[PDB]
Amino acid sequence: EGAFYTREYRNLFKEFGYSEAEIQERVKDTWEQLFGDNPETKIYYEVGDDLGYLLDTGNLDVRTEGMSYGMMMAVQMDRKDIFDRIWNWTMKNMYMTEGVHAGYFAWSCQPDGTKNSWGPAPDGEEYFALALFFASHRWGDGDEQPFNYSEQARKLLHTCVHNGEGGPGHPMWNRDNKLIKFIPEVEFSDPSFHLPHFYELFSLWANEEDRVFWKEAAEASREYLKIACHPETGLAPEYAYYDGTPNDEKGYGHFFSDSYRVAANIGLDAEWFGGSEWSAEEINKIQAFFADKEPEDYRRYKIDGEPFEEKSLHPVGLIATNAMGSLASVDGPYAKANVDLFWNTPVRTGNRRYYDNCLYLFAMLALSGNFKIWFP
Ligand code: NI
């Protein structure tokens, strides 16, 4: 039974023999390396007295993925000051009032706030919504907008489901199949965006008129992951059609950066809402695939396991997500090995570090029992 029911979160590091003190230290140190003054590893930058952002170090921009991740990290760490700085910057610079995506958040901005695009990234929106619910529950809704967290969360999820009913916009979920879309204007998806564990919570906290929908989306996403992951290797493509097969029209049909999050998502869903045979078997497959592979040699792979020459651009993120996956297969043959590999992998330095380090902190939180559901 999941932590949603028991209200107790598995500390997998502790169960695998790491000491409580060393785990506490490592979690704090990971946070400080990302959010404190550690220039080589840092991803969060403060602006003035009321603003802040996470920088995609590779692309030298600010992404809704990173901002929404940062808000989730901040609420898990009980840091309202950081949460509010990030959410303030997001609302000021990213929220769109004009164009076909009005009501959504521009996916990429320059550090000065300028929008690079008026298109959104749905995985940002879903993280914003849950982070905002958790903020409301930990701290209470603020008296002034946009710090009225729960109202902001319900409003955003309203748009995600209903956009286009009274305008030229489009929803972020397909209403017939209940699957999240890659972007609002296409009819394909991205397995790593599927967060059934988030949708379960939306089914409790969203506008009542959408609560049944969110339950259906949770179930649809769970079923979709079964068809999207390769049956032998467990590997999921970055983009996939609704039929589950890879969309490689632009090179996103393989196991690469986006895909890494699938194992992590499966880990967190198992922890929050309970284990399943499918999830344990899926994590065992991914871990088996990587069991004889050295991180320095990690590649892009076809989902059937065939390697490309191209190296993984985010091998530390891959390590972190595979370790986080162990939450879904705690007795798996490679579960301990993956957790140990992650323990022995430092936070990333250099220009590609942002993505790796986001995945790293999520795994540190989840594996230590600190990635929690915050209830009203
Ligand atoms: Ni120590």
From Swiss-Prot:
Q: Name one Pfam family in it.
A: Glyco_hydro_8
Q: What is its EC number?
A: 3.2.1.156
Keyword annotations for this protein, in alphabetical order, are: Carbohydrate metabolism, Glycosidase, Hydrolase, Polysaccharide degradation, Xylan degradation
Q: Does the keyword Nucleus apply?
A: no
**What positions constitute the catalytic site?**
65 (proton donor), 258 (proton acceptor)
Q: Summarize how pH affects activity.
A: Optimum pH is 6.2-7.3. Stable between pH 5.0 and 9.8 for 30 minutes at 30 degrees Celsius.
Catalytic reaction(s) noted:
Hydrolysis of (1->4)-beta-D-xylose residues from the reducing end of oligosaccharides
Report the record's Gene Ontology biological process terms.
xylan catabolic process
What InterPro entries does UniProt report for this protein, alphabetically?
6-hairpin_glycosidase_sf, 6hp_glycosidase-like_sf, Glyco_hydro_8
Asked if Hydrolase is a keyword of the record, the answer is yes
The main enzyme category here is hydrolase
Temperature remarks? Optimum temperature is 50 degrees Celsius. Stable up to 40 degrees Celsius.
Could you tell me one molecular function GO term of this UniProt entry?
oligosaccharide reducing-end xylanase activity
Q: Which family does it belong to?
A: Belongs to the glycosyl hydrolase 8 (cellulase D) family.
Briefly state the protein's biological role: Hydrolyzes xylooligosaccharides with a degree of polymerization of greater than or equal to 3, releasing xylose from the reducing end. Only hydrolyzes the beta anomers of xylooligosaccharides, with inversion of anomeric configuration. Hydrolyzes the glucose and xylose-based trisaccharides where xylose is located at the -1 subsite, GXX, XXG and GXG. Does not hydrolyze xylan, chitosan, lichenan, curdlan or carboxymethylcellulose.
Instruction: Provide the protein name.
Output: Reducing end xylose-releasing exo-oligoxylanase
Q: Which organism is it from?
A: Halalkalibacterium halodurans (strain ATCC BAA-125 / DSM 18197 / FERM 7344 / JCM 9153 / C-125)
